């Protein structure tokens, strides 16, 4: 496979994709900000279990508009008024606007897009607005000793409103699964593994292995997750993993390394 390869500046070439790579990407970012549309575009080869996805959100008098799109063909990432589908609450952590109650309305520009609500703590914190991820209609999150991710998703007007989701205010499931992260050496080692109390709808015991895309090490995690969160696609973008294992189960402690 070969994909067009262009940096922010825009100098382009044909990248012979390395062994394993089978998808060509085009990440487009946009920033409207009081009368100036700012477009940056990266293209390159990219790893599998990736999907077309986009997120648009309002920071004060600005709009940030993320987009990525992929396909399997050779050089598939080559070349590529007022629309109104869904009213979605929006804000951001980049100006502590989501953290407060300054919750603007953002109209979805595409029929597929849905109202989102994410929270991301280790490794912006809070985000709200319009976007698309595959099979989205519904909520799905995860947490362990330190990390906490969540992503609600809905298709009706202003459905992503109300207070900001904090892990602390959520109840206890009763489910207890093991909490670790790292490599099976110094990381997810059996003494380094331990029991935590699951929360909210995250009542599945989860383990997920893979490889940290930035540096060629492998990497593992365990904790409490939703069923929908149990998914090969979703852990690979929350933690930049790929070539993944994702096991899930509903017995308190069926996580444990021994039980892999």
């Amino acid at each position, epitope marked *: 496979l070969r994909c067009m390869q262009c940096k922010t500046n825009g100098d382009c070439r044909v990248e012979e994709c390395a062994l394993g790579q089978d998808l060509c990407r085009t990440t487009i970012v946009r920033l409207w900000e009081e009368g100036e549309e700012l477009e940056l575009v990266e293209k390159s080869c990219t790893h599998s279990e990736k999907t077309n996805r986009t997120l648009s959100y309002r920071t004060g008098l600005k709009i940030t508009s993320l987009t990525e799109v992929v396909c399997g063909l050779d050089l598939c990432n080559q070349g590529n008024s007022r629309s*109104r*589908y*869904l*009213e979605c609450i929006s804000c951001g952590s980049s100006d502590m606007s989501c953290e407060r109650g300054r919750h603007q309305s953002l109209q979805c520009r595409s029929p597929e897009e849905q109202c989102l609500d994410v929270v991301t703590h280790w490794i912006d914190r809070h985000l709200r607005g319009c976007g698309y991820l595959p099979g989205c209609p519904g909520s799905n999150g995860f947490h362990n000793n330190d990390t906490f991710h969540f992503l609600k998703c809905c*298709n009706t007007t202003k459905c992503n409103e109300g207070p900001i989701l904090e892990l602390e205010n959520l109840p206890q499931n009763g489910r207890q699964c093991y909490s670790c992260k790292g490599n099976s050496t110094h990381g997810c080692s059996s003494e380094e593994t331990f029991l935590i109390d699951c929360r909210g709808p995250m009542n599945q015991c989860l383990v997920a292995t893979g490889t940290h895309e930035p540096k060629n090490q492998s990497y593992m995690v365990r904790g409490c997750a939703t069923a929908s969160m149990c998914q090969h696609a979703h852990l690979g973008d929350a933690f930049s993993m790929n070539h993944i294992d994702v096991s899930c189960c509903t017995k308190s402690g069926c996580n444990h390394p021994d039980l892999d």
Partner: antibody
Amino acid sequence: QVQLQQSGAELMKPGASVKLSCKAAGYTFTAYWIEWIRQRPGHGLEWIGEILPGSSSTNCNEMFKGKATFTADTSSNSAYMQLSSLTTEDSAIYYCTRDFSGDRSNLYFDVWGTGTTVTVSS
Amino acid sequence: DIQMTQSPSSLSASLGERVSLTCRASQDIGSSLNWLQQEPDGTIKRLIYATSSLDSGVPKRFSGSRSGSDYSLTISRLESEDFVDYYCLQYATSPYTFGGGTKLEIKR
């Protein structure tokens, strides 16, 4: 209170132009597009076009190319629609409503003028 | 240009009877469809915005709902005041379009 006030009924010789108006009240005039809707006798509602005061920006249904022409005077909180080269079939009621420029669905097509009659005949 | 196919064009019913009318979009328009009510004197008022949201002061027997491409306005316990013309309006993408209207009748 919020209001959209419309010009009087017009009786017109075919081949003329007439300028209907929709005077706004109660709200920030520039924050909302003004929409023009035609309704012919015993016929249904059709969308003519729109214009955002106080901007140079307007849209229209393609069918009304050459017929409908939109302007607005912010001083007077007034929006206008000229219909040029009139025929029989321009005989209709013409309502104006508002469509908020921002996002906030509750403020779209929420309040309505009560219409202007235009009758064209020899 | 999107089109909306409204039905029924004409409908007769009695007091108490629940009724429903429907607009079908030729393309996806999200939840961005509104419903309109026109009085015999030509006066137009809005009842439902964004598919399901009720207008303020509108009596709660009126209600909105989508199913796929079919967005459906529903009245439960009819009143004499309700027997009038109704239209849907999509504002997803200009040129914006309307239904062909529905005339409501009292059954005698």
